[PDB]
Amino acid sequence: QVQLVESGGGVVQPGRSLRLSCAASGFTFSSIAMHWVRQAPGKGLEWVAVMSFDGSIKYYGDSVKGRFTISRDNSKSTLYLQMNSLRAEDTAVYYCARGVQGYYDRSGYYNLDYNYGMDVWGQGTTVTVSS
Amino acid sequence: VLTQPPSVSGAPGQRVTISCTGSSSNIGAGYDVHWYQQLPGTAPKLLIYGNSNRPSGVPDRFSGSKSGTSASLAITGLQAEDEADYYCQSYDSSLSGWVFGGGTKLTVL
Amino acid sequence: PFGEVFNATRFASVYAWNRKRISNCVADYSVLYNSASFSTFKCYGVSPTKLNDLCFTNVYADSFVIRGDEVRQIAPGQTGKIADYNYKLPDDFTGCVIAWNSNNLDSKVGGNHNYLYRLFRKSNLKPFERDISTEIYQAGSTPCNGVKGFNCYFPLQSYGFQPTYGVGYQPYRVVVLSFELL
Ligand SMILES: *[C@@H]1O[C@H](CO)[C@@H](O[C@@H]2O[C@H](CO)[C@@H](O)[C@H](O)[C@H]2NC(C)=O)[C@H](O)[C@H]1NC(C)=O
C-alpha cells in the first residue's frame, strides 16, 4: 500500500523560514528520486526542486533559485524541504511526489535529466504567507 | 511554460482533444510529454506517461500523442465524471528543470 | 559471446521472449558501449565501464521487439500493458536496457502480423515469467469454451508495423541484460 503523507502546514509571516517533512511507506525509498511541486490557489501547477538517488544531484526551479533547500533521509524514509525567507508569493499547496527509480548512465556518468513523470503523489501541505 | 488552452467542452459520447503547444527547447528538444488528471480537491494522478503509455488503472479512452513540438490528447466517449483539469509536463534543458502546462478545465455538458 | 543476440536476424514478439543465458566465456562488454548506434542505453544497478568483475556465470540477455513509445515500460516500476501482461522486469534491477531502432528491418507496407503483444491476461505478470498460451479471455460474461463472439476476446494482438509511421510507433528492438551470481 504505497502512500506519501507530508506535514508542515500553517500560516507564517513574510521573511522567516519553514520545513516540510514527507513520509513514505510501502515501497523502497532508497532507490527512487523525489520531487517537490507546488500549486498557487486556483492557478496551475509548478515545479520546485528534486533530490537524486542518494543526495548528489539537486536542481531547483526558476523562482525558488536561492531561497529553497531540499534534503532527504533514507533512515526513516523521509524527504525534507527547507524554504528560507518566504516571500508573500510562496503560498501554495505543496505536493510531495514520487519521481522515478531511473538512475541510468552510459559511459559511467550518472544523471538526472529524465523523461518519466511523477507516479504517485502526496496529500499537500498548504502553507500560507500573510501579514 | 507550455501553451495550453483554458477550457475545452464536449457533450457525452463525443471526442474532445486537449492540445498543448510547447517551445523548441521544451518538447522539440526531445523530452516526453505526460498528462495529469487533477480532480478538484485531490492530488493529481499520472494519466499518460512517455507520450503513449497508459498506466494500469486508466481506461482505454485516453489516447495521447506527440507531434514535433506540440503534443495532444484525446478523450473518446467522455462521461459525467471527467470534470478534472488536465495539465502537461516535460523537461527544459535551457532551464535545467521540469516544466508544467497551464490547465484545461474540461467540462461535460 | 553476444554477437548472437544484438545482431539476430529474426527477433521475438514480446509475449514470447527468448531468455538466453551466456556462461563459460570471457564477456567483452566493450562493444556494447563506445557505439552510437543505440537509441537508449540505460544501465541501472551496476555501471558501464565498471562491469569487469566476476559475472561469468549466468549473464542473461532477453530480447523482444516493441513499439517506440513502449520502451518506457522496460524500467523498474513503470506499469502499462507491456510491463503487466508481456514482460515485467523487477524493481530491484541490475542489468542494462538496450534499445535501437529497427524501422528498415521490421516494417511492411501492408503490415507485419508476426509480431504480437498479449493484451488480455487474468493477473499481472511476475518478475521474469513468460506466458505463451492462447485462451479466450471471458472478460465480463459467464465464461464459455471460446467462440470469439460477443465479450470474447482473442488474447493476442498484432502491432501492424508500417514504414511511414510516427517515431513513437516505429518498431524498436529491445535487449535487456541481467547478471546474477552464486
Ligand atoms: C553487429 O554487427 C555489426 C556489423 O555487422 C557490428 O558493427 C561493427 O563491429 C565491428 C567489430 O569490431 C567494428 O569494428 C565496426 O566498426 C562496427 N561497424 C559499425 C558501422 O559500427 C556490431 O558491432 C555488431 N554488434 C555486436 C557484435 O554486438
Short mmCIF file of C-alpha atoms and ligand atoms in Angstrom, two decimals:
data_model
loop_
_atom_site.label_atom_id
_atom_site.label_comp_id
_atom_site.label_asym_id
_atom_site.label_seq_id
_atom_site.Cartn_x
_atom_site.Cartn_y
_atom_site.Cartn_z
CA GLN A 1 0.00 0.00 0.00
CA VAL A 2 2.04 2.92 -1.34
CA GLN A 3 1.39 6.29 0.31
CA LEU A 4 3.09 9.63 0.95
CA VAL A 5 1.97 11.69 3.94
CA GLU A 6 3.59 15.10 4.34
CA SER A 7 3.49 17.60 7.20
CA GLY A 8 4.47 21.17 7.98
CA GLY A 9 1.37 23.24 7.31
CA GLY A 10 0.43 26.54 8.88
CA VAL A 11 0.29 30.29 8.35
CA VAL A 12 3.58 32.17 8.64
CA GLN A 13 4.90 35.66 8.09
CA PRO A 14 6.94 37.00 5.14
CA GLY A 15 10.65 36.90 5.96
CA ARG A 16 11.03 33.71 8.02
CA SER A 17 11.51 30.00 7.31
CA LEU A 18 9.72 26.65 7.38
CA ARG A 19 10.41 22.95 6.88
CA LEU A 20 8.32 20.33 5.06
CA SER A 21 8.67 16.69 6.07
CA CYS A 22 7.17 13.89 3.95
CA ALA A 23 6.94 10.24 5.00
CA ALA A 24 6.95 7.29 2.60
CA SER A 25 5.97 3.66 3.17
CA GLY A 26 5.17 0.56 1.16
CA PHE A 27 7.99 0.97 -1.37
CA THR A 28 11.78 1.20 -1.50
CA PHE A 29 12.52 4.84 -0.71
CA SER A 30 16.30 4.43 -1.03
CA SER A 31 16.25 3.92 -4.81
CA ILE A 32 13.74 6.43 -6.25
CA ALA A 33 14.29 10.14 -6.96
CA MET A 34 11.85 12.56 -5.35
CA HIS A 35 10.32 15.91 -6.35
CA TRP A 36 8.56 18.86 -4.75
CA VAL A 37 5.74 20.59 -6.65
CA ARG A 38 3.50 23.45 -5.58
CA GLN A 39 0.22 24.92 -6.79
CA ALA A 40 -0.93 28.51 -6.28
CA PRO A 41 -4.61 28.68 -5.14
CA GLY A 42 -6.81 28.18 -8.18
CA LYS A 43 -3.84 28.53 -10.53
CA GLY A 44 -1.80 25.93 -12.41
CA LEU A 45 0.92 23.58 -11.27
CA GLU A 46 4.56 24.50 -10.78
CA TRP A 47 7.77 22.59 -10.11
CA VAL A 48 10.15 23.44 -7.25
CA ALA A 49 13.01 21.01 -6.63
CA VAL A 50 14.32 17.45 -6.99
CA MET A 51 16.61 15.24 -4.89
CA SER A 52 18.57 12.43 -6.51
CA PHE A 53 19.15 8.74 -5.78
CA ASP A 54 21.40 9.26 -2.76
CA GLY A 55 21.57 13.05 -2.45
CA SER A 56 24.12 14.10 -5.04
CA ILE A 57 22.11 15.90 -7.75
CA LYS A 58 19.80 18.80 -6.85
CA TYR A 59 18.12 21.01 -9.46
CA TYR A 60 15.85 23.86 -8.41
CA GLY A 61 13.07 25.81 -10.04
CA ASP A 62 13.21 29.18 -11.71
CA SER A 63 11.51 31.02 -8.82
CA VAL A 64 12.96 29.36 -5.71
CA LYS A 65 16.54 29.82 -7.02
CA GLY A 66 18.44 30.88 -3.91
CA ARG A 67 15.67 30.53 -1.32
CA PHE A 68 14.97 26.80 -1.06
CA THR A 69 16.94 23.77 0.14
CA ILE A 70 15.97 20.10 -0.27
CA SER A 71 17.30 17.22 1.84
CA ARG A 72 16.36 13.58 2.38
CA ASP A 73 16.72 10.79 4.94
CA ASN A 74 16.80 7.14 3.89
CA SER A 75 16.88 6.02 7.54
CA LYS A 76 13.25 6.93 8.26
CA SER A 77 12.22 7.23 4.55
CA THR A 78 11.51 10.94 4.66
CA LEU A 79 12.13 13.81 2.24
CA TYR A 80 12.87 17.33 3.52
CA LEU A 81 12.42 20.81 2.03
CA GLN A 82 13.78 23.94 3.69
CA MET A 83 12.17 27.15 2.46
CA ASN A 84 14.22 30.16 3.56
CA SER A 85 12.90 33.75 3.62
CA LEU A 86 9.38 33.02 2.40
CA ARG A 87 8.04 35.81 0.21
CA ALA A 88 4.35 36.76 0.02
CA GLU A 89 4.05 34.75 -3.22
CA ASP A 90 5.18 31.32 -1.92
CA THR A 91 1.67 30.47 -0.73
CA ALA A 92 0.53 27.24 -2.38
CA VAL A 93 -0.33 23.63 -1.69
CA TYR A 94 2.96 21.73 -1.62
CA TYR A 95 2.85 18.25 -3.14
CA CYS A 96 5.40 15.56 -2.32
CA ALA A 97 5.62 13.46 -5.47
CA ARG A 98 7.46 10.22 -6.12
CA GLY A 99 9.80 10.52 -9.06
CA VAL A 100 11.23 7.53 -10.90
CA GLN A 101 13.71 4.78 -9.98
CA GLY A 102 15.73 5.89 -13.05
CA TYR A 103 19.40 6.18 -12.24
CA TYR A 104 20.90 5.28 -15.58
CA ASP A 105 24.29 6.09 -17.09
CA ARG A 106 26.12 5.42 -20.32
CA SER A 107 29.93 5.69 -20.22
CA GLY A 108 29.80 5.81 -16.43
CA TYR A 109 28.37 9.21 -15.53
CA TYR A 110 25.04 9.02 -13.71
CA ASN A 111 22.48 11.73 -14.45
CA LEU A 112 19.00 13.07 -13.53
CA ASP A 113 17.51 14.82 -16.61
CA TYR A 114 14.79 12.39 -17.42
CA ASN A 115 11.53 11.93 -19.27
CA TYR A 116 9.46 9.98 -16.72
CA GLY A 117 6.77 11.76 -14.73
CA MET A 118 5.62 11.53 -11.14
CA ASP A 119 3.82 8.26 -10.43
CA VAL A 120 2.19 8.65 -7.00
CA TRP A 121 1.55 11.95 -5.28
CA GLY A 122 1.18 13.18 -1.74
CA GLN A 123 -1.67 14.92 0.03
CA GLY A 124 -0.50 18.51 0.40
CA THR A 125 0.85 21.00 2.92
CA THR A 126 -0.99 24.31 2.48
CA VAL A 127 1.41 26.91 3.84
CA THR A 128 0.17 30.50 3.72
CA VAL A 129 2.16 33.72 3.86
CA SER A 130 0.31 36.80 5.09
CA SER A 131 0.51 39.92 7.22
CA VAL B 1 5.78 27.35 -19.80
CA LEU B 2 3.75 25.28 -22.26
CA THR B 3 0.87 26.93 -24.12
CA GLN B 4 -2.38 25.13 -23.28
CA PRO B 5 -6.00 26.21 -23.87
CA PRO B 6 -8.05 27.41 -20.88
CA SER B 7 -11.15 25.23 -21.26
CA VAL B 8 -12.50 22.58 -23.63
CA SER B 9 -16.11 21.49 -23.94
CA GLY B 10 -17.86 18.31 -25.02
CA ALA B 11 -21.23 16.60 -24.78
CA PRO B 12 -21.22 12.94 -23.64
CA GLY B 13 -20.25 10.42 -26.28
CA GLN B 14 -18.26 12.98 -28.26
CA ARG B 15 -14.47 13.28 -28.64
CA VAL B 16 -12.57 16.19 -27.07
CA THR B 17 -8.94 16.99 -27.89
CA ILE B 18 -6.84 18.84 -25.30
CA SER B 19 -3.97 20.34 -27.25
CA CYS B 20 -0.65 21.54 -25.84
CA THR B 21 1.95 23.63 -27.67
CA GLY B 22 5.47 23.88 -26.26
CA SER B 23 8.66 25.60 -27.29
CA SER B 24 11.62 24.29 -29.29
CA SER B 25 13.54 23.59 -26.07
CA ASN B 26 10.61 22.16 -24.09
CA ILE B 27 9.13 19.46 -26.32
CA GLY B 28 11.16 19.91 -29.52
CA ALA B 29 14.37 19.23 -27.62
CA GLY B 30 13.17 15.64 -27.41
CA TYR B 31 11.72 15.11 -23.95
CA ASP B 32 8.45 13.27 -23.42
CA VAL B 33 5.10 14.89 -22.61
CA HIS B 34 2.95 13.48 -19.82
CA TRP B 35 -0.58 14.33 -18.74
CA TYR B 36 -2.22 14.53 -15.33
CA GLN B 37 -5.82 14.22 -14.13
CA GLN B 38 -6.37 16.56 -11.19
CA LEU B 39 -9.88 16.34 -9.82
CA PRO B 40 -10.82 19.43 -7.77
CA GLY B 41 -9.78 18.77 -4.19
CA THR B 42 -7.48 15.82 -4.93
CA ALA B 43 -3.80 15.38 -5.74
CA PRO B 44 -3.24 14.70 -9.46
CA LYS B 45 -2.62 11.28 -10.92
CA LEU B 46 -0.41 10.48 -13.91
CA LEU B 47 -2.77 9.89 -16.82
CA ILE B 48 -0.30 9.07 -19.62
CA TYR B 49 3.50 8.90 -19.45
CA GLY B 50 6.05 8.71 -22.24
CA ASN B 51 3.56 10.24 -24.77
CA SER B 52 1.62 7.00 -25.22
CA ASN B 53 1.94 4.63 -22.25
CA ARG B 54 -1.18 4.41 -20.26
CA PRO B 55 -0.55 3.01 -16.76
CA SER B 56 -2.54 0.33 -15.01
CA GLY B 57 -5.78 1.95 -13.96
CA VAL B 58 -6.73 4.47 -16.62
CA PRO B 59 -9.35 3.19 -19.09
CA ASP B 60 -8.89 2.89 -22.85
CA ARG B 61 -10.45 6.29 -23.63
CA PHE B 62 -7.35 8.49 -23.12
CA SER B 63 -5.21 8.14 -26.23
CA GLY B 64 -2.30 10.59 -26.04
CA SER B 65 0.04 11.73 -28.81
CA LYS B 66 3.08 13.84 -29.71
CA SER B 67 4.00 15.56 -32.98
CA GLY B 68 7.16 17.62 -33.27
CA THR B 69 6.98 20.43 -30.71
CA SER B 70 3.26 20.21 -29.84
CA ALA B 71 1.70 17.20 -28.14
CA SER B 72 -2.01 16.44 -27.66
CA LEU B 73 -4.57 14.15 -26.03
CA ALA B 74 -7.98 12.75 -26.94
CA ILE B 75 -10.91 11.52 -24.84
CA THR B 76 -13.50 9.44 -26.69
CA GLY B 77 -16.84 8.66 -25.10
CA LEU B 78 -16.38 11.09 -22.22
CA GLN B 79 -18.75 10.66 -19.31
CA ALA B 80 -20.11 12.73 -16.43
CA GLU B 81 -17.09 12.22 -14.15
CA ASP B 82 -14.41 13.90 -16.32
CA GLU B 83 -14.70 17.30 -14.65
CA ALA B 84 -11.00 17.35 -13.82
CA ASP B 85 -8.20 19.58 -15.05
CA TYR B 86 -5.54 18.26 -17.41
CA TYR B 87 -2.00 19.65 -17.19
CA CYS B 88 1.18 18.72 -19.05
CA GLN B 89 4.76 18.00 -18.06
CA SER B 90 8.10 17.99 -19.84
CA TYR B 91 11.75 18.92 -19.39
CA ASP B 92 13.61 22.09 -20.39
CA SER B 93 17.38 21.86 -20.75
CA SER B 94 17.71 25.64 -21.12
CA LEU B 95 16.07 26.00 -17.69
CA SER B 96 17.52 22.72 -16.27
CA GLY B 97 14.11 21.99 -14.78
CA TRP B 98 10.75 20.29 -15.17
CA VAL B 99 8.01 22.40 -16.71
CA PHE B 100 4.24 22.05 -16.45
CA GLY B 101 1.32 23.16 -18.58
CA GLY B 102 -1.29 25.74 -17.72
CA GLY B 103 -4.53 23.90 -17.08
CA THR B 104 -7.51 22.92 -19.24
CA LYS B 105 -10.82 22.78 -17.38
CA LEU B 106 -12.66 20.03 -19.23
CA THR B 107 -16.39 20.44 -18.65
CA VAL B 108 -19.11 17.99 -19.65
CA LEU B 109 -22.38 19.49 -20.84
CA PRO C 1 29.62 -14.30 -26.92
CA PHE C 2 26.88 -11.72 -27.74
CA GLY C 3 27.32 -11.13 -31.42
CA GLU C 4 24.38 -13.55 -31.47
CA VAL C 5 21.68 -11.60 -29.60
CA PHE C 6 22.38 -7.99 -30.60
CA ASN C 7 22.59 -8.98 -34.27
CA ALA C 8 19.97 -11.73 -34.55
CA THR C 9 18.07 -11.88 -37.83
CA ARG C 10 14.53 -12.59 -36.59
CA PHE C 11 13.56 -11.11 -33.23
CA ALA C 12 10.83 -12.42 -30.96
CA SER C 13 7.48 -10.86 -30.20
CA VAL C 14 7.18 -9.60 -26.66
CA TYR C 15 4.68 -12.13 -25.28
CA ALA C 16 7.09 -14.96 -26.23
CA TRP C 17 10.57 -13.66 -25.44
CA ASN C 18 13.71 -15.77 -25.70
CA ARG C 19 15.63 -15.92 -22.42
CA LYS C 20 19.20 -16.71 -23.42
CA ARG C 21 21.95 -17.37 -20.90
CA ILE C 22 25.63 -16.96 -21.70
CA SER C 23 28.24 -18.55 -19.45
CA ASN C 24 31.73 -20.14 -19.51
CA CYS C 25 33.19 -17.32 -21.58
CA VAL C 26 35.12 -14.07 -21.44
CA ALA C 27 32.45 -11.40 -21.79
CA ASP C 28 33.68 -8.41 -23.76
CA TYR C 29 31.32 -5.59 -22.59
CA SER C 30 33.38 -3.09 -24.63
CA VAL C 31 31.40 -3.36 -27.86
CA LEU C 32 28.09 -2.51 -26.16
CA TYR C 33 29.23 0.99 -25.26
CA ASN C 34 31.55 3.20 -27.41
CA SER C 35 28.93 2.74 -30.16
CA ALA C 36 26.46 5.47 -31.13
CA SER C 37 24.04 3.01 -32.75
CA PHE C 38 21.74 2.81 -29.72
CA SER C 39 18.70 4.96 -29.06
CA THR C 40 18.51 4.12 -25.34
CA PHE C 41 21.31 2.63 -23.24
CA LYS C 42 20.18 2.72 -19.61
CA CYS C 43 22.03 0.56 -17.09
CA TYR C 44 20.59 0.57 -13.60
CA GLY C 45 22.36 -1.37 -10.86
CA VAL C 46 25.97 -1.74 -11.95
CA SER C 47 27.56 0.86 -14.13
CA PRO C 48 29.16 0.51 -17.55
CA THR C 49 32.97 0.89 -17.67
CA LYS C 50 32.98 -0.96 -14.32
CA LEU C 51 31.40 -4.37 -15.02
CA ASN C 52 34.66 -6.26 -15.43
CA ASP C 53 34.02 -8.13 -12.18
CA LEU C 54 33.13 -11.82 -11.96
CA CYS C 55 29.80 -12.17 -13.73
CA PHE C 56 30.73 -15.08 -15.98
CA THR C 57 28.10 -17.42 -14.50
CA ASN C 58 24.63 -16.79 -15.95
CA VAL C 59 24.61 -13.46 -17.69
CA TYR C 60 21.27 -13.36 -19.50
CA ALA C 61 20.01 -11.37 -22.49
CA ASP C 62 16.25 -11.07 -23.02
CA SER C 63 15.33 -9.87 -26.50
CA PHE C 64 12.00 -8.78 -27.95
CA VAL C 65 10.53 -6.15 -30.25
CA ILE C 66 8.07 -3.47 -29.09
CA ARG C 67 6.77 -0.18 -30.41
CA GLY C 68 8.72 3.00 -29.92
CA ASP C 69 6.91 4.75 -27.08
CA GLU C 70 6.57 1.46 -25.17
CA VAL C 71 10.32 1.48 -24.48
CA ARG C 72 9.48 3.47 -21.34
CA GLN C 73 7.81 0.39 -19.79
CA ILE C 74 11.07 -1.58 -19.52
CA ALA C 75 12.20 0.35 -16.45
CA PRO C 76 11.79 -0.72 -12.80
CA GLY C 77 8.24 0.14 -11.88
CA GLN C 78 6.54 1.79 -14.89
CA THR C 79 3.37 -0.23 -15.28
CA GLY C 80 1.37 -0.42 -18.51
CA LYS C 81 0.19 -3.09 -20.94
CA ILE C 82 3.71 -4.33 -21.70
CA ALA C 83 5.11 -4.36 -18.17
CA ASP C 84 1.95 -6.06 -16.88
CA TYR C 85 0.94 -8.72 -19.39
CA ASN C 86 4.02 -9.20 -21.60
CA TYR C 87 7.37 -8.61 -19.85
CA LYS C 88 7.81 -7.31 -16.29
CA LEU C 89 11.35 -6.80 -15.07
CA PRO C 90 11.56 -6.46 -11.27
CA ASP C 91 12.04 -3.42 -9.07
CA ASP C 92 15.49 -4.33 -7.72
CA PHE C 93 17.14 -4.47 -11.13
CA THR C 94 20.83 -4.57 -12.02
CA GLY C 95 21.08 -5.15 -15.78
CA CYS C 96 21.11 -2.65 -18.63
CA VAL C 97 18.29 -1.74 -21.01
CA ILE C 98 19.42 -1.51 -24.64
CA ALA C 99 17.13 -0.46 -27.49
CA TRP C 100 17.81 0.61 -31.06
CA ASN C 101 15.55 1.44 -33.98
CA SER C 102 14.54 -1.23 -36.48
CA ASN C 103 12.41 0.70 -38.94
CA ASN C 104 14.14 -0.62 -42.05
CA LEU C 105 14.09 -4.24 -40.87
CA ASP C 106 10.69 -4.91 -39.29
CA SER C 107 8.29 -2.79 -41.37
CA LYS C 108 6.00 -3.88 -44.20
CA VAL C 109 3.64 -1.67 -46.20
CA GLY C 110 0.69 -3.98 -45.58
CA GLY C 111 1.78 -4.74 -42.03
CA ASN C 112 3.77 -7.35 -40.10
CA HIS C 113 1.35 -9.53 -38.18
CA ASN C 114 4.06 -11.89 -36.94
CA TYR C 115 4.82 -9.51 -34.07
CA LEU C 116 2.30 -9.56 -31.24
CA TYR C 117 1.63 -8.38 -27.71
CA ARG C 118 -0.59 -10.03 -25.12
CA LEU C 119 -3.39 -7.61 -24.34
CA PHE C 120 -5.65 -9.65 -22.04
CA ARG C 121 -4.23 -11.53 -19.06
CA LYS C 122 -6.03 -12.60 -15.91
CA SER C 123 -3.39 -11.35 -13.46
CA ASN C 124 -0.24 -9.27 -13.74
CA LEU C 125 2.99 -10.94 -14.76
CA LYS C 126 5.57 -11.80 -12.13
CA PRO C 127 9.22 -10.64 -12.44
CA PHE C 128 10.74 -12.68 -15.29
CA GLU C 129 7.83 -15.01 -16.05
CA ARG C 130 6.56 -15.71 -19.56
CA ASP C 131 3.13 -16.71 -20.87
CA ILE C 132 2.53 -18.01 -24.40
CA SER C 133 -0.95 -19.51 -24.09
CA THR C 134 -3.88 -18.67 -26.37
CA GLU C 135 -7.02 -18.73 -24.23
CA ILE C 136 -10.22 -16.78 -24.80
CA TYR C 137 -10.39 -14.14 -22.11
CA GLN C 138 -14.07 -14.19 -20.93
CA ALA C 139 -13.92 -10.63 -19.60
CA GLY C 140 -17.35 -9.91 -18.13
CA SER C 141 -19.84 -12.62 -19.00
CA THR C 142 -20.34 -16.14 -17.78
CA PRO C 143 -17.36 -17.96 -19.33
CA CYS C 144 -17.58 -20.38 -22.24
CA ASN C 145 -15.41 -22.76 -24.25
CA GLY C 146 -14.41 -19.95 -26.61
CA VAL C 147 -16.22 -18.99 -29.81
CA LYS C 148 -14.74 -15.43 -30.13
CA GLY C 149 -18.18 -13.85 -30.27
CA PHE C 150 -19.57 -11.12 -28.01
CA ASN C 151 -17.38 -10.28 -24.99
CA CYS C 152 -14.90 -12.98 -26.04
CA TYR C 153 -11.53 -11.50 -26.93
CA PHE C 154 -8.50 -13.02 -28.60
CA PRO C 155 -5.64 -12.90 -26.08
CA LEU C 156 -3.03 -11.59 -28.52
CA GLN C 157 -2.96 -8.58 -30.81
CA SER C 158 -0.56 -7.64 -33.57
CA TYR C 159 1.24 -4.35 -33.98
CA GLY C 160 0.90 -3.93 -37.73
CA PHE C 161 4.13 -2.04 -38.30
CA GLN C 162 4.47 0.25 -41.31
CA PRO C 163 7.33 2.34 -42.76
CA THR C 164 5.70 5.78 -42.64
CA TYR C 165 4.51 5.65 -39.02
CA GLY C 166 5.49 8.12 -36.35
CA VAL C 167 8.70 7.73 -34.38
CA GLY C 168 6.65 6.64 -31.38
CA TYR C 169 5.07 3.87 -33.44
CA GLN C 170 8.15 2.63 -35.31
CA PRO C 171 9.38 -0.82 -34.21
CA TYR C 172 12.17 -0.85 -31.62
CA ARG C 173 14.22 -3.91 -30.71
CA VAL C 174 14.99 -4.20 -27.00
CA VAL C 175 17.68 -6.36 -25.38
CA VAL C 176 17.78 -6.44 -21.57
CA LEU C 177 20.80 -7.86 -19.75
CA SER C 178 20.66 -9.42 -16.28
CA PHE C 179 23.56 -10.52 -14.08
CA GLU C 180 23.30 -12.79 -11.04
CA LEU C 181 25.86 -14.92 -9.21
CA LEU C 182 26.37 -17.72 -6.69
C1 LIG D 1 26.61 -6.32 -35.15
O1 LIG D 1 27.18 -6.28 -36.47
C2 LIG D 1 27.74 -5.01 -36.84
C3 LIG D 1 28.17 -5.14 -38.28
O2 LIG D 1 27.96 -6.46 -38.78
C4 LIG D 1 28.87 -4.65 -35.89
O3 LIG D 1 29.37 -3.35 -36.20
C5 LIG D 1 30.79 -3.37 -36.43
O4 LIG D 1 31.51 -4.09 -35.40
C6 LIG D 1 32.93 -4.15 -35.62
C7 LIG D 1 33.51 -5.01 -34.52
O5 LIG D 1 34.90 -4.76 -34.36
C8 LIG D 1 33.51 -2.73 -35.63
O6 LIG D 1 34.90 -2.80 -35.89
C9 LIG D 1 32.80 -1.89 -36.69
O7 LIG D 1 33.26 -0.54 -36.61
C10 LIG D 1 31.29 -1.92 -36.49
N1 LIG D 1 30.62 -1.19 -37.55
C11 LIG D 1 29.97 -0.04 -37.34
C12 LIG D 1 29.34 0.58 -38.55
O8 LIG D 1 29.89 0.47 -36.23
C13 LIG D 1 28.36 -4.66 -34.45
O9 LIG D 1 29.44 -4.44 -33.55
C14 LIG D 1 27.69 -6.00 -34.12
N2 LIG D 1 27.13 -5.95 -32.78
C15 LIG D 1 27.56 -6.71 -31.75
C16 LIG D 1 28.69 -7.66 -32.04
O10 LIG D 1 27.05 -6.63 -30.64
#
